[PDB]
Homo-oligomer: 353 residues x 4
Amino acid sequence: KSKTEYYNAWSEWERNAPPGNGEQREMAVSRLRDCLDRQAHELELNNLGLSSLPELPPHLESLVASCNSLTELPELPQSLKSLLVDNNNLKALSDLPPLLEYLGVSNNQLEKLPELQNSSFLKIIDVDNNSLKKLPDLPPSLEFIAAGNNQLEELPELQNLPFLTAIYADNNSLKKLPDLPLSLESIVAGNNILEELPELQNLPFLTTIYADNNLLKTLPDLPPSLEALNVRDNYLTDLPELPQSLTFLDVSENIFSGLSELPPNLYYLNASSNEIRSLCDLPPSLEELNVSNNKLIELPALPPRLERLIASFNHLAEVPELPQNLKQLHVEYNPLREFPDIPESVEDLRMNS
Amino acid sequence: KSKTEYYNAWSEWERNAPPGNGEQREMAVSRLRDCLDRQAHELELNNLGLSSLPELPPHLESLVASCNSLTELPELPQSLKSLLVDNNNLKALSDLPPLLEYLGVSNNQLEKLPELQNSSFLKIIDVDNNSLKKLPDLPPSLEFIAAGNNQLEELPELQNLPFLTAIYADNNSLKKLPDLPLSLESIVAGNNILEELPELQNLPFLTTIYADNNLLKTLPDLPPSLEALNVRDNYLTDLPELPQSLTFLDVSENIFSGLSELPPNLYYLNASSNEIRSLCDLPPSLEELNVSNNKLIELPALPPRLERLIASFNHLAEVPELPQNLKQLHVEYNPLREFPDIPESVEDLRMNS
Amino acid sequence: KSKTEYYNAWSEWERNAPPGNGEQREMAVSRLRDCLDRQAHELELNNLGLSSLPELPPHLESLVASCNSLTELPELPQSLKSLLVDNNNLKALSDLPPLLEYLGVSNNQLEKLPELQNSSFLKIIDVDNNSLKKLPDLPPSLEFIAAGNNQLEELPELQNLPFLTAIYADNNSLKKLPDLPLSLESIVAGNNILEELPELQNLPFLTTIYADNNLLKTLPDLPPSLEALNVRDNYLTDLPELPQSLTFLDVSENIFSGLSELPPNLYYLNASSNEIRSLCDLPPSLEELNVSNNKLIELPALPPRLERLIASFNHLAEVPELPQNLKQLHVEYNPLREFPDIPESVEDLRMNS
Amino acid sequence: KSKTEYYNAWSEWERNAPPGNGEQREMAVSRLRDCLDRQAHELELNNLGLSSLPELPPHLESLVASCNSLTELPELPQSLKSLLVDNNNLKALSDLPPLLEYLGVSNNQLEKLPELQNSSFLKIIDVDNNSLKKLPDLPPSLEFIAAGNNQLEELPELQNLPFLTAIYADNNSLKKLPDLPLSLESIVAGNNILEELPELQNLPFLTTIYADNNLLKTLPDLPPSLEALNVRDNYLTDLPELPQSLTFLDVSENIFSGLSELPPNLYYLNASSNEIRSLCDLPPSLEELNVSNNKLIELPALPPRLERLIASFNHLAEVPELPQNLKQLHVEYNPLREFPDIPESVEDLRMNS
Ligand SMILES: [Ca+2]
Ligand SMILES: [Ca+2]
Ligand SMILES: [Ca+2]
Ligand SMILES: [Ca+2]
Ligand SMILES: [Ca+2]
Ligand SMILES: [Ca+2]
Ligand SMILES: [Ca+2]
Ligand SMILES: [Ca+2]
Ligand SMILES: [Hg+2]
Ligand SMILES: [Hg+2]
Ligand SMILES: [Hg+2]
Ligand SMILES: [Hg+2]
Ligand SMILES: [Hg+2]
Ligand SMILES: [Hg+2]
Ligand SMILES: [Hg+2]
Ligand SMILES: [Hg+2]
Ligand SMILES: [Hg+2]
Ligand SMILES: [Hg+2]
Ligand SMILES: [Hg+2]
Ligand SMILES: [Hg+2]
Ligand SMILES: [Hg+2]
Ligand SMILES: [Hg+2]
Ligand SMILES: [Hg+2]
Ligand SMILES: [Hg+2]
Ligand SMILES: [Hg+2]
Ligand SMILES: [Hg+2]
Ligand SMILES: [Hg+2]
Ligand SMILES: [Hg+2]
Ligand SMILES: [Hg+2]
Ligand SMILES: [Hg+2]
Ligand SMILES: [Hg+2]
Ligand SMILES: [Hg+2]
Ligand SMILES: [Hg+2]
Ligand SMILES: [Hg+2]
Ligand SMILES: [Hg+2]
Ligand SMILES: [Hg+2]
């Protein structure tokens, strides 16, 4: 196919624009042209309303066509390494270029994908916000996958994936998680119907876990190097032993009546909306404490590093001495005897009765 | 004292106004005058900024002087039957006229009151929003008392009060409630530190109970004619047998995993922010259902009378058939397969993902 | 008709209940019975889901049947003086008992009413939240009418009504208001399409005006004894001379670049969301000042009576000295140099940057 | 200095930790060690509470020490090219390494900086959220500067800066802007006290302008290739001719009574909280329309590409036909005759009366 055949095919499609429709085909024909004419690497046709695309420049490596109205894709160069067509109306994808490394098709209406484990170089897959009832088996080169907000009832098996690092499977219908891979670094699976978590204690690189909004009564022993744990809105009464590496913990909307000693490097603690009665001493590394909406009548001595204190909706008659770097103080709706002495660092303040 | 002595005393006080201060003493001197001159029943000096009052017209029956800046009151006619001085800066009250029937002194800085049980005609007492550490014994003529938002650690004994009908003691520090009077109709005691409620089952007129935001793990058997129960934000797993008269129930922010059959006249049910998994059938009299922020994946068949459905933040894939008079539909943030068919009655709608 | 015929007619209707439907006809048959049996004045059938009513007890004076599902009403006793059927599905009303004094039919689907000016004792009419495209002429005995939230394009003529005291005609499509009656005390007509107000200066009892959310560029001279004026969200640049009786003024969401001297008894001033640059001195009676979201860089000296200061979203580098009774301070999002010294009265505080 | 001298100096400082204080000096001594031991490029000591730093490894190029508590910095290697010490308590900076390219010191308490125009390789300067009353002259290599939220009354002269691309000077006290450089691509200066903008029409690369929340009555002729304009909350009645390249326009909170034809590629239009009466036809490329809180009674025909329609708080009796890809519909509080027919694309809906 010659330059002139491309150019001409592109002027045909541009005149094919649904007349009123708002499609910026001229703008699109200019980008194809310069792209063919500059023999660029990547073609950017984002947000031009296209309800379709013409034949693409051969040898392109990356197609950026998101935020259009595609229901179908044209044939793609076999040189293609990156496909970014999020925010379209695709209802299915066909098999893909064989060198694809990056698949982005989130915010589409996908109901099924091709056989992903045949694409030997897919590193990153994003099919967030589609209508997938199930996931195909995944290729072993996969490094990252986001499949949140679909309608998944099960996930593929994951433990054999040699390079999987992160999974987003939140907002689905999983009742169970598969055994996880040793390389996994993070798992985000909030809002599923997990009645339990798989075994975690043997995962030496798992650093982040989100399992908020599920059905947990209990947690397994944690990965020894866990750093951030979010299990907000579950039915937990107790926690397993917490790794000394933990630095972010969200236990809000559970059913704790107290918390025993937290690990000593914790920076952020969100334990709001529990039934907590008492706090004993806090880690001195703690910078943010949110215990809003609990049943406290006294707070423990405040960590010297604290910069954020959210203790709204409790029964406190008084705030303990505040740290010289407090930046945010929110202690609205407590039966407060007196105004604590506000440090000069405080730049955001709320107080009430 | 003559008209002229009154008039003159009132012009002295009016010239005594702190100069800039914004006090509307002229306005006040006109009301005293016409009041003396019309020999009115009641004197209205509300919201004129007075930092004080002069001698009052003799024989008045009611003084309305709220929303001023009084720290002290003048001597009051012994004819006085009603004293409304809410929203002032009083830090104590002296003994009162002996015919007082109505005492209103809420939104002041009271730290102690006189010996109330000596005032034989006090029917209604309001000392909400003061700084009372304790309540005096109450007169047996008391019909109503509101002492919410003080710093009460205990309440007077109440069971001997022959006409007590309603108590507001919410937002205090009660760890315990006294045995309640047989005549009591309503008790409002949210936000105290109740570890338990007194015996209720023998109270044949108790119709309303608010004990939200306390420390209850369990409830006593209820008054057989209970109509409204609010126990939001406690630690309840189960309820006692619910009276068939119950028509308003708030169990939000407790720890229910389900609810068995509700009484058949219930009109309003707020069970949001629990851990509910399933609902079996609902009372057909139900007009409002709030089960927001639970763990539902299916709703039960909807009552024909329902006009308000708040089912935001759950896992529903679909809304069941809606009743022909639904007026409000809020089902935002559910993994909703499809839009339910909205009845023409619906005037307030929210839907999302 | 005998007791037994009533009783029996009522048991027929009760068995006629749509089977599942949730209708509390038994409850309704008990109230009719005791009502007939006690020969009560008023019959209360509120909120029982009735989709209809049987024949009513003769000689009743008041019917309370609101919050049901009526599309039609039964014949009413000619003794009827009060009809409260708000919150039903009526799509029309027939002519009414001739002694009716109180008509309440708000929250229904009325598209037309009978000839109201023939009912010689109608004092109060409420047909708020219906679908009335026009109002019938009104009877001269009318004292109050609320016809807000209908679809009125015009109002009846009002100036001849000898006792009209208050009108709610807000949320309609009026492009114009009729000349108003001398007795009128209040007019609420927010959210219409008023391009102008009628002449007001000759109304000696008008005390309250709501005309927020219309199309005013200008206001007529005001009633000399005006006390509350709300003209929020119009296109005003200037105000007419303001009566010294004015005590509530809402000029928020207009286009003022400043305000000259306010009357000296003003208690509340809401001038938020204007383009105000400067405030000169304030009335010393002022208790609430809301000037949020303006273009201020300095506030004027604060009135001694002020209890509420809302000055959020401005450019202030500092708050002036606060009055010893300030109760509420909201001065969030101002480029604040320093924290003002908070008086011990302040019970609600917000500060930020 | 030898490895051992470093190591030892670092153990001295670590033992110097204020005892309780929460400072993670051990963690810091490990990073210095491995950094010296790996002879890394960059040293990362973020968020360890340090109230100080020991001597740094020589030849480092980048220091990341933000989110500590420094009031002072140690001497820095002259090899230093990047200094990231945001979120500390520095009250002044000394002269910097001479090869510095990146200066990050936002969220500190700076009151004055050294003589910036002597640092010949500073490309990026961020001193957002400090207390600078004035800016020093800038070096000609500057590419980006953010000095928002300080207390600047004037800016340095900018027009001579050969490579300046972007300026953030929002939230200051500027009454005037300097003439701008030909290379400038974006200017963010919301919330200052601009009474006017400099000449813009000769700026061929200016693409973005934020001047929301100032005092503009009028705008200069715009840069011919302008793409995004935000002038929310000013006093504009009219706009200059708008470039056909404009694609983002925010005129919310101004005083427009209408808008004539918008440029044909506009994607987003926020004209909420004006006084708009009518809209004539819209650009067919428009994807977001926000005209909330205006005075509309009819909308114009809706663009085929629209995905977001925010038309809350108007007087509409009906919504026109909705586009097949509408994703968001918010038309709450309009006197809506009927529910429009919702397209299957709509995933976020609000409707009300
Ligand atoms: Ca709780
Ligand atoms: Ca609570
Ligand atoms: Ca829960
Ligand atoms: Ca939840
Ligand atoms: Ca403004
Ligand atoms: Ca503003
Ligand atoms: Ca407006
Ligand atoms: Ca408005
Ligand atoms: Hg190309
Ligand atoms: Hg898009
Ligand atoms: Hg995009
Ligand atoms: Hg307490
Ligand atoms: Hg409390
Ligand atoms: Hg301290
Ligand atoms: Hg907060
Ligand atoms: Hg009197
Ligand atoms: Hg007041
Ligand atoms: Hg009051
Ligand atoms: Hg589900
Ligand atoms: Hg979900
Ligand atoms: Hg039905
Ligand atoms: Hg809601
Ligand atoms: Hg009766
Ligand atoms: Hg109702
Ligand atoms: Hg009602
Ligand atoms: Hg300023
Ligand atoms: Hg500002
Ligand atoms: Hg003062
Ligand atoms: Hg506020
Ligand atoms: Hg190093
Ligand atoms: Hg920090
Ligand atoms: Hg940071
Ligand atoms: Hg309208
Ligand atoms: Hg309206
Ligand atoms: Hg269409
Ligand atoms: Hg909205």
